[PDB]
Amino acid sequence: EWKPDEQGLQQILQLLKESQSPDTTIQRTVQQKLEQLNQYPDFNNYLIFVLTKLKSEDEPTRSLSGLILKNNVKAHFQNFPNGVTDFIKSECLNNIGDSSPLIRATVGILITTIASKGELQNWPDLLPKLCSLLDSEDYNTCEGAFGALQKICEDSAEILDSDVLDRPLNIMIPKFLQFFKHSSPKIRSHAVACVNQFIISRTQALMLHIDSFIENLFALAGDEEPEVRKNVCRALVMLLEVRMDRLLPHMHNIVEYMLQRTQDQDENVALEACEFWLTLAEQPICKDVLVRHLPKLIPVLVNGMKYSDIDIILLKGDTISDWNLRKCSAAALDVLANVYRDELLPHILPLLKELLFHHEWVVKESGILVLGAIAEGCMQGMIPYLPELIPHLIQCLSDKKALVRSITCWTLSRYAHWVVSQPPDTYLKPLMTELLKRILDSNKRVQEAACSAFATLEEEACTELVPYLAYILDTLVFAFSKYQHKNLLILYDAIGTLADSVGHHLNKPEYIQMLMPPLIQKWNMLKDEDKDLFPLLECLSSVATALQSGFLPYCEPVYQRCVNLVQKTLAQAMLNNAQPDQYEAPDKDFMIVALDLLSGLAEGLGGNIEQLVARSNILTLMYQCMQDKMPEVRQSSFALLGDLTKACFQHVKPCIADFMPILGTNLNPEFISVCNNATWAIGEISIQMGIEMQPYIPMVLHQLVEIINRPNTPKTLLENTAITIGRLGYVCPQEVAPMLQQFIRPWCTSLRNIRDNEEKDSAFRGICTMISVNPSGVIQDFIFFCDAVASWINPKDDLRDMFCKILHGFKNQVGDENWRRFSDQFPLPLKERLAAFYGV
Amino acid sequence: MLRLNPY
């Protein structure tokens, strides 16, 4: 055994007395003395002695000794001697059922801590020992063992459900179920809590005893103890997700039970009971089994959506829980509205009409929340009531209480689509005017709500925002001086969404003069590796696309930062590929948006981006991105490639020899987005290159013909394929000519549905040069070529002559009598168009 | 989540 030294022990007791000193200036001096002894082993051997052996000391003094020992395990267990731990673990299990509730708790937290920091495999004699303490005749020993077992089950769930401890769950789980019928409520609650840890994981030991579990759950249904109710509720909620089949026959009994528990006195029990409705609603059998309970369920949920008296104080002046009865009831009501749709209206409509116009703001606020929660589902049914509710809600935007104002913003944004469909002078105009007011609200929460609601309204209004663009920009710009932290990020979203809505209408000198200077300021002040950079990155990306040529005086610092982010991202990518454990993995999202912004500048600024391209390694980095394993990265790279090809090919041309083999291997139709941009890339390159395109053709030509022939291919992909093929045959027809008969069918089938733009023009210029070389392939399928040529409404005069020569060359080859019967299968507009526009 | 929800 081990015996302590009295003199050393006396100073340890002194250290415990100094730790209990009320003065704050003394507590810091003793912690430094303990920190030195903490590193010293054998010191912990003294602490465990004071806790258990030394019973001549105060209960808080002994307990403090055991709790200091706990903190040493949480930090220095990697250095704990094997001789010491064996004594501590032996001393704890001998006092696991101490008479003193304070001592029993201290021993309890020690045992679970050793099994937490130190792995369970290092203490194999713990589990079978604890189970043997459950059958103990002593009560406190039983409780102490269960209290420890529950914490172990909570900490290490996956460990117990593995071959690490030789499957200890096959003994404990059947053992726990036998304690559901125990006398003490603390023991009964302990048992349920342990089993619940293995419901979702579908533990074999529990799944084969599922019938014994459910039967024992129903036995505890009418239990008065809240802690027991809570775990039973948690049990049924989990069981509802994994074993629906075994609950279905008893479903109606459960629903009536949960309905009473949702209305329970203790909010903790009600919250766990409320989770049932949220999980049940996402089941394909809900609509049938719950329809008989809807009249009773709806008012329960609505009543639970009110702010509690405790919540109101915490909000005035996040500061509240991330999840409570309010949010849970509201979430359940939302999904329920999506299940029954309009069938939920007779149960909610009469409730709303009392809530929305109630005098108590707390009651009124809840009604507004309800009205927004059922918006998505009961949309088509709320229509007749919207002409009354919407103007009322707009009035509620100027309510005295802030919590009423903020929720009204959200609820209004839920019905944003209907507002836009109506005449803008009736609903849209006052809504927009009042929202802009609430953006500059004094209350921070209302600011967030209004700015979020306005952003939602922008996606629905789109071009309807133009007549208000002057007022909108004034409000948003001014918000920069007020908005900080969480309020600032939402503001970027409101600005970016605006740019994606008004489009080129934003491009005006007075608008740019207000919007850009505060944006560039934030663009420079913000450091890298910041969580405020990304929302601004997406913001400017939208603005650059909208402003187009107006972004030129501000493109310099934006271009450089984007190139830097791409380079920095590729840097961390290499470090993570070589030493994954030592270096953090990079976030590709910052690089993808950066590439998209660069692609936006290349397209928006055109040839004015030429100088910035040469003074940077944008093409070198681009070469690396095209080889990345992530599809989204390769997609945004090829897009940037094609844009720079049109912007400034004189800087791109040197790197064509290396880009082409990459583009040729990325023509995989598996990745639609990547394949499309790649196909479009080589097309734009083919134009700038010219006759110099010949050595790169045979490695991509066979690829394109394959793609344009494969069935179930998306419309946009077939278009860009046909356009590219035609573009290849325009500069170098000789290599594409013999393939003409192979792709002549889907080429005309696809490009007959597109408008007469530049892409179509260059494509048809290529199909004419190839026909002039190989007129053979077009003969067999000439009916498709005629339909494709007739698709042209206003072709260029030189392109018209090309069409005319081919048509006349064909008519003078087969004869007139062979041309009439050939044109008898032509539709009415097809035959008349060719006969007049081309005179054939 | 970029836009605040009461849920």
Residue numbers in the entry:
A (entry chain A): 4 to 320, 368 to 890
B (entry chain B): 326 to 332
From the paper:
Moreover, we determined the 3.0-Å resolution crystal structure of the karyopherin transport factor Kap104 in complex with the eukaryote specific RpL4 extension. RpL4EXT harbours a canonical basic phenylalanine-tyrosine nuclear localization signal (PY-NLS) and alanine mutagenesis confirmed that all canonical elements of its consensus sequence are critical for the Kap104–RpL4EXT interaction. To explore whether RpL4EXT residues Lys310 and Lys340 are protected by Kap104 in a similar fashion, we determined the crystal structure of Kap104 in complex with RpL4EXT to 3.0 Å resolution. The Kap104·RpL4EXT structure revealed that the PY-NLS of RpL4EXT engages the concave surface of Kap104 in the same binding mode as previously established for other PY-NLS sequences. RpL4LOOP residue Lys56 along with RpL4EXT residues Lys310 and Lys340 were identified as Tom1 recognition sites, which were ubiquitinated in the absence of Acl4 and Kap104. Upon Kap104 binding to RpL4EXT and formation of a nuclear import complex both Tom1-modification sites of RpL4EXT are sequestered by the concave Kap104 surface, consistent with our previous protection results of an in vitro Tom1 ubiquitination assay. Our structural and biochemical analysis demonstrates that the RpL4 extension possesses overlapping binding sites for a second Acl4 copy and Kap104. Indeed, in a competition experiment Kap104 replaced the RpL4EXT-bound Acl4 copy to form an Acl4·RpL4·Kap104 complex. Kap104 replaces one Acl4 copy and shuttles Acl4·RpL4 across the nuclear envelope. Once in the nucleus, Kap104 releases RpL4EXT on RanGTP binding allowing the rebinding of a second Acl4 copy from the nuclear Acl4 pool.
